Every structure is written in C-alpha cells, then in structure tokens.
Amino acid sequence: NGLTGTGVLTESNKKFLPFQQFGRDIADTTDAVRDPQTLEILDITPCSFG
Amino acid sequence: AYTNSFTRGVYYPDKVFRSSVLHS
Amino acid sequence: AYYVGYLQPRTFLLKYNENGTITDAVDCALDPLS
Amino acid sequence: IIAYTMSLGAENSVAYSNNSIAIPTNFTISVTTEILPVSMTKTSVDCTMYICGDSTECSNLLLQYGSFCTQLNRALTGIAVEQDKNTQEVFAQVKQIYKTPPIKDFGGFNFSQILPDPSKPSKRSPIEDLLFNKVKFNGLTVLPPLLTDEMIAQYTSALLAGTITSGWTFGAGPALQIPFPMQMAYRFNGIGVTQNVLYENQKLIANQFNSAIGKIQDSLSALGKLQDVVNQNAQALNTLVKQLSSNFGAISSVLNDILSRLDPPEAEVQIDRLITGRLQSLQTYVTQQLIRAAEIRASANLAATKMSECVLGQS
Amino acid sequence: FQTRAGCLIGAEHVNNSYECDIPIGAGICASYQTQSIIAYTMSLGAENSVAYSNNSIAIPTNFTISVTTEILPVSMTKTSVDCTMY
C-alpha cells in the first residue's frame, strides 16, 4: 500500500503496536512491514549480493 | 489559574514501528 | 476542570522500548544538560 | 562545582649531601598491563553501487568521470591487505607451537590464570576470556580476517610456553630448557642484583608474583583504546550511509522519483548533482580511512617491537 | 565448498594443513597442488616439545655463523606538476 521495495519476505516474531504499519532500523531503512489484509508482521531482508 | 505540566503531551510522530532507539 | 496548552516547533529525543512504545523523552532546549 | 588552578603533584626535597647515600633493604614484584591496537575491520565499498545504485541512467553518466572508482577500490583493498600483515607481524613470531608439560612445578610460581583453558572450544585463558567480554547495505561489505582468533590464542599460548620453559633461548634459536627458578635468577643478574637474593627469598618472591597476578583480574572484571578504535570506524561508516539521503541541491535524493517525474534532458541535470555529492562523500570516507590506517600501523609496529624485546628477551 | 568467507567453486577441500599460499579468509587458504586447486586450514607451524623438568638443562656445544638480508626503502621520485599546463 505505498511501500515500494525489493527483497526476501519472511515470517516475523516482532509485535508492532496496533496502529503501526512498518518498522525501520537505525540508519533508517525499512526492515519490517505489516500485511494489510491478514495483519501479520513480515521481515524484509535484502537480496543475496556480494 | 495556571499550572505546570511536567512531561506531558508526547505523541507518536507517525506510523512505522520501532524499538530501543533514542530517536531524534 | 480542564487545561489548554499550545504547541511549538521543538526537537525531542524519544526513547523507544523493545515492544516499540515511547517510555521516556528529552526536551533538548530546556537546559544545558538536556 | 568548583574551578581551580591545577596542582602538578606533591613536592619533596631530596636529602642530598656530599657524603650521604640511600640503599634499599627490600623489594616488591610488580605486574602492570599495557594495551595496544593491532588492526581495524576490513571493509569494501562498491563505488558504482553506492553512487548510482540499481538505476541505469546513473551508470552511463558516471562512466563519464574516468577511473575515479577504480582508484577508490584500490585504496580500500590496500588497507585490507595491510590489516592481515599487521597481525602476522605481531603474533606469528614463533617457529614451533610449544606446549607446557603436564606438571606445573615452576618453583612456586603459578601461571594458571594465563595458561589456556582446556575446557573450552576457544581454548582461551581466564584473562583472555575476561578481555573478550569487555570489548548488508548499499555496496558495503566486511571481509573476515585471515587468522581466526582461535589461531591468535594458539600463537599466544605457544609464546607463553616458550618463555616459561626456555627463558629467552627460543627467541634466538632452538629452545633450551632451564628450571624456572634458575631462569629467574639469571634475570635478577640482568638488573644488577646478585643471584642469591633470589634463592634466599624464593617463596616471598613467588607469593608477591601470585598476588600481583591475582590483582589484575580484579582490576579488570582500561580497554578504552581498543574500544576507541572500534567506534571511530562504526561512526565513520554510519555517516557514509546517512549521506545518501541528501539532495545536494537537486529536487530529491532518491534516484527514481527524480527519474519518473522528469524527462531525460531535464533529469540528467539533477542526477549529475546527486552524483557529484555522492562521489565527494566517498572520497572523504576513503581519505580518512587511509589516514586512520597509518595510525594503526604505527601501533602494530610498536607492538611487534615490544613482543620481540619484552617477551623474547630482557630489556 | 562453503566457507565463513563465502562459497568456493572449483577447488577441492582436503584434510591436510600446509603453509598458507593464497589467502581466502577466516583461516582458509588455497593452493595449486593436488593437479588442481584445494582448500584447507593453514598451519601455524611445526610442533616442538621442550623436555622441561625441575633439574634439567640443555647447553649448546657448537654454533653457526649466519648472515641475512634486510631491505628498506629510503626515497621515492621527486615529481613536479604545472597546474596551468595540465
């Protein structure tokens, strides 16, 4: 719903507050989201590179 | 009358989760 | 009984819990320590 | 809160005269620590992926600057190759991997807090365990060191067993065993004390050593030097990433929104400003890493000389 | 072959341990020996066991005169540029 990105999506085990959509890291990069339809938190890890 | 707040009126500036991070 | 404050442009330092809630803050224009 | 003029120290007149002397009647055995950095973390930045970053309108524009990115990668690779040579020069100062014998009859001297711990995966000593509990992105990568720190702990324990068993002979050739009390008596001669002063005071001297070694753990359980090093690097790497959200005088700082809201002739102008800013940031970063690595090298050079001259001999 | 430094393709992993030749990382080196290319964990050095005791000494009966070299840079080339002409 607006957040555009790339990466691997994975089942999370963090708990947002029930009005927060996505989570950010220190240095300010999106690293978790909440799925609008099912309302579950998913981590966003980058794509294997090197 | 007038009174003194102490530490009052703090709101979450927006969505986006977050944990232990003295964010400015 | 009710109160009315007003809001100004300030800069704060918010401490976030591990669940993601704000537990403490610092107003950075109060005094030299802050 | 008080403001004062600082004192330089206590004052004392020496009782100098033309026929007076002062001779010591006892001694103490001291042990003191010295801590030195020998390496930094090996990092590598992909110039093209930090600047442009995915986009393709950026890569062709950056191709116009020549070999600016090849120079920066060479500069960072030299630094990373120097960090392994720092460690090889400090620690791999021994031919063989020496072992202590299964007994510990060292004349009453007790080295158990600094010999390796057989009940561990890492096989570190008690004091090396105390010391180790106190200290992906936009093209950024951290390479691992060539030597594990298991290997480093294995070099240090062999240097220790060489000293406790052979004195200084293993640093000049083949290790020649000598009993520890007699080696201690050779060393008392080197500071100008006659060697019966050791043999007639062996128990007291061994107790003083043992208490001084015991005080070091308490004084430990300091390392701000190494910490300083570690930090100075994390904070300089955080600034490089934070510099990617700045427009440098373009409309925005994200290479898509500039690109999907203007047409090429119009967008190339802003993308060149973004490129200029992001290349300046990377040059600042690399120049400071070059200046900071030459300071770590002068410190590892001092450590190598200390390991040669204070551990493999008497100074 | 999986390493703490990444994935290595085209070299076989052996169980011996030699002196380091080409440094891969995290204790792993490579060499062209066994041919082809192989992997393994470097060798710190031989293994010497001092026969230490509370009343034993070793004393040398001979010597060798050895001579080694040490090379050091003292200077580099003096260059000048003319800003305007460049």
Place this chain on the structure above:
Amino acid sequence: SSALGKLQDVVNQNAQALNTLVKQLSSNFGAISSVLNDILSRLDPPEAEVQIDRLITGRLQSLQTYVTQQLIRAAEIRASANLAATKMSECVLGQSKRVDFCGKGYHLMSFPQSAPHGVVFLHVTYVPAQEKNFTTAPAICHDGKAHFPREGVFVSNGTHWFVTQRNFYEPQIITTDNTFVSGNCDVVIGIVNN
C-alpha cells in the same frame, strides 16, 4: 643472483599513479568533448565558458586527489627511512643487544649496501647449535656453606660436577675462584653436596 619486492612495490605505486593522472586528460566529466580545441573553436566565449568549466572542475579534482595520495605515501616512506637511519646507527656503527633488531640470533655485526631507492643490511649473527642435556643445581653445599657460580652454571655429566658458561659447553672444576659463598646450605632448595 638467481626478493627486492619492497623496492619494486614502491617504484611501481608511483608509476601507477602518474599514469592515472594522465589518463584523466581524456574524460569529459559531462562535456561535449575532452579537447579545448573542439569546445573552443566550436563555440562562443559566452557558451564555451560553461563546457570549459565542467572540464576545469574535473581536472582540478583529479590533480588534487593525486596530491593528497602522494602526501600519504611520502609520510610512509619517511618512517621507513627513519628506521633505516636508526639501523645504520645501531647495527652498523655498534653492536645491538635489542632482540631481533639486527637479524635473528645474537647480533655480531652488520654491513650496508646501497640499492636503487633504499638500503640492504647484511646482518651477521651467532646461532648456538647441537645441544646436550645435563642435570643442574642452583648451589653447592660444602663445609656447611652454600656456593654460587660467579658467571656460569653448575652442571653434572652423570657423576661429576662442573661449571660452564651458559652459551657454550666448556666444563671446569668447581673451585673457590669461580664460585662465591653466601649463607648456610639449608635455605636454598635444590642444593647438592659436592
């Protein structure tokens, strides 16, 4: 005749930088060409004053990068020459006692030789060889007194007791000329009777 990589390395680093400096005289940095006779004799001073500035900025950047990296490389050559000057004083005009400063072994003497941009030291050291074990004692008890060697070690070939010097085996009869006395023989641990 059949190793000078430090010198080679230095002599090289400088050439690789000087070539990168010249190879930058053929980049546009965002201009129509790399030649001023193509931007000049092809435009008006009012417009050519823009395309020329894009070249000026790039070339200034490249020259100043060259000059920074030379300062950083010269500060490293300076420390090497400062170490060479100390080794010439302490290994060539003296005998050093510092361990592993003038070779590996016990320093006897050093000889200098000149090289293209540096110096080679030839270090001559003594290395002990062919060791034997004996048995030792710290002191000898005799007439109720404890004797210590003046400058050696007490050793035993199995049945007899001698004094050697510590780095070369040369046994001598224990006499009152190569030992000294202090105390009685019940406080030292390890005394032998002889």
